[PDB]
Amino acid sequence: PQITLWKRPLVTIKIGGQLKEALLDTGADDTIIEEMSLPGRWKPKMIGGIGGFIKVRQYDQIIIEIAGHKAIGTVLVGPTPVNIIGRNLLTQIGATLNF
Amino acid sequence: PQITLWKRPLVTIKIGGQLKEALLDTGADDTIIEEMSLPGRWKPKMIGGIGGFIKVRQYDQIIIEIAGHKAIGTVLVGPTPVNIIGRNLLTQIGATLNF
């Protein structure tokens, strides 16, 4: 798909068998989702956003489907205004910016 | 051009007569630039994201050259950690996400 930016680039994702909405975010290094249960161990990570830094939980090698495209990679869980798909998974689904 | 997302999608912009580096950010509704002077009227605004909210000045009808392409729109100025080109100007240069 070709996604224009006149509205927010919201897509459906599937993680742990559940459908969620998430924003495709080229300004995000990493993928972060709202509080939910993920399998396995987690590690700490600090992330910087527009209003400051926050601590989050980093879960590696998580299966996630994004707009029907399969990915397996790192997902952060923490306080975010919206679920965000960042570059670590956008690269896996082959996304590019074009102008 | 076609920009991959292996690294942060940084481009050179010209705004207010000044050259700056900025991030092409599809997650951002708005364009946000580090503290600088711009001509004309402004009004205060709060914008938020991970880590909370920051107060900015909202300038309307500002012309910005983005990687060689001219666009006009609202620009927010304030203590952002990175200059951000958001969707309000990405649309004007014809930027799309493709996968």
């Binding site: 975010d25 300004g27 995000a28 290094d29 990493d30 972060i32 990570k45 600090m46 992330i47 910087g48 956003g49 527009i50 830094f53 975010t80 965000i84 960042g86 | 942060r8 991030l23 950010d25 997650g27 951002a28 994201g49 991970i50 952002t80 950690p81 990175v82 951000i84």
Partner: peptide, 5 residues
């Protein structure tokens, strides 16, 4: 630190 905006 990584940045998310």
């Amino acid at each position: 630190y990584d940045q998310i905006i």
